[PDB]
Design an enzyme around this catalytic site. Structure first.
Site, PDB file in Angstrom:
ATOM      1  N   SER A  76       0.938  -1.376   0.034  1.00 23.55           N
ATOM      2  CA  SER A  76      -0.122  -0.114  -0.120  1.00 23.55           C
ATOM      3  C   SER A  76       0.774   1.339  -0.023  1.00 23.55           C
ATOM      4  O   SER A  76       1.701   1.448  -0.967  1.00 23.55           O
ATOM      5  CB  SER A  76      -0.891  -0.257   1.119  1.00 23.55           C
ATOM      6  OG  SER A  76      -1.809   0.956   1.258  1.00 23.55           O
ATOM      7  N   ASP A  91      -9.403  -4.013  -5.784  1.00 21.63           N
ATOM      8  CA  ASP A  91      -8.975  -2.817  -4.630  1.00 21.63           C
ATOM      9  C   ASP A  91      -9.625  -1.789  -4.881  1.00 21.63           C
ATOM     10  O   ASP A  91      -9.949  -1.161  -6.033  1.00 21.63           O
ATOM     11  CB  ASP A  91      -7.255  -2.865  -5.097  1.00 21.63           C
ATOM     12  CG  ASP A  91      -6.625  -2.002  -3.905  1.00 21.63           C
ATOM     13  OD1 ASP A  91      -7.228  -1.050  -3.170  1.00 21.63           O
ATOM     14  OD2 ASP A  91      -5.341  -2.413  -3.662  1.00 21.63           O
ATOM     15  N   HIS A 124      -7.787  -4.784  -1.057  1.00 22.10           N
ATOM     16  CA  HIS A 124      -6.549  -3.950  -0.825  1.00 22.10           C
ATOM     17  C   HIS A 124      -5.551  -4.978  -0.028  1.00 22.10           C
ATOM     18  O   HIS A 124      -4.232  -4.606   0.083  1.00 22.10           O
ATOM     19  CB  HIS A 124      -6.784  -2.577  -0.008  1.00 22.10           C
ATOM     20  CG  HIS A 124      -5.364  -1.750  -0.025  1.00 22.10           C
ATOM     21  ND1 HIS A 124      -4.489  -1.506  -1.242  1.00 22.10           N
ATOM     22  CD2 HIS A 124      -4.994  -1.100   0.797  1.00 22.10           C
ATOM     23  CE1 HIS A 124      -4.026  -0.568  -0.845  1.00 22.10           C
ATOM     24  NE2 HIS A 124      -3.970  -0.465   0.567  1.00 22.10           N
TER      25      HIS A 124
END
Length: 265
Positions: A131, A177, A209
């Site tokens: 991320s 995502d 995600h």
């Protein structure tokens, strides 16, 4: 730099590699990052190993990415999973913390009293980031200084220097995502990397995600492809190339898109 058994698919998909993995806690009071855990193999043969830092994340702690610690270390790497200074830190702050954490690992290998004394080759370092930590990892790859990069569902500004990346980079994208949508993050980041730079894009069917963090339905493939990437590019171990170059990756249920520039020479 090659070590260990000739790999096979089953050996690479198993939950552990062949080596026994020990750990040491790194205090949250360490300079330049938030602490973490060093994972290292105890029976990997006497030679020095590449060093890897694994960094979060989306508003999350070391625990979110910890699975990558034993998975990589059990195949012959010294791997530190980390916390950042705060959960709110932005990708460029995360980049700086990767660099500080890699230097800490080198410093501990260079000490006389650390359990990892002597074990790290300071010329062979790498980063794995989820991320916003994936954005930080790609930023560090653009600047040089690591020899391999893996990005797990990366998030980053669309203003970046990813067109400069010379570092072999594997991107895991999570198909569904919504925090870092593939069309705005993982996909354009992968496409920007020079075609001369070894790279790969594995999109995981149905993934949110968190899909590339491991410990989940995707574990076998994340571990096979991620270990093969580090073996090939950090150890120059061409025995791992056939797992990345040759198979029809997208024929598997769990891969919804594949891209790459095989072969890697």
């Amino acid at each position: 730099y090659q070590r260990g058994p000739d790999p096979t698919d089953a050996y690479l998909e198993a939950a552990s590699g062949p080596y026994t993995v020990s750990t040491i806690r790194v205090s949250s009071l360490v300079p330049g990052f938030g602490g973490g855990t060093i994972h290292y193999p105890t029976n990997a043969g006497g030679g020095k190993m590449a060093g890897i830092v694994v960094i979060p994340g989306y508003l999350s702690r070391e625990s979110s990415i910890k699975w990558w610690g034993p998975r990589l270390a059990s195949h012959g790497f010294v791997v530190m999973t980390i916390d950042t200074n705060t959960i709110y830190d932005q990708p460029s702050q995360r980049r700086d913390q990767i660099e500080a954490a890699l230097q800490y690992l080198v410093n501990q290998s260079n000490s006389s009293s650390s359990p990892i004394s002597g074990m790290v080759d300071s010329s062979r370092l790498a980063a794995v980031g989820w991320s916003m930590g994936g954005g930080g990892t790609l930023q560090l790859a653009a600047d040089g200084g690591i020899k391999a990069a893996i990005a797990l569902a990366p998030w980053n500004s669309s203003i970046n220097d990813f067109n400069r990346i010379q570092v072999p980079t594997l991107i895991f994208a999570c198909q569904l995502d919504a925090i870092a949508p593939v069309a705005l993050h993982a996909s354009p980041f992968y496409n920007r990397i020079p075609n001369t730079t070894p790279k790969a894009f594995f999109e995981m069917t149905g993934g949110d995600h968190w899909c590339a963090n491991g410990g989940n339905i995707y574990s076998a493939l994340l571990g096979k492809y991620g270990v093969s990437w580090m073996k090939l590019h950090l150890d120059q171990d061409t025995r791992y190339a056939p797992f990345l170059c040759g198979p029809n990756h997208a024929a598997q249920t769990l891969i919804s898109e594949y891209r790459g520039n095989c072969p890697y020479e």
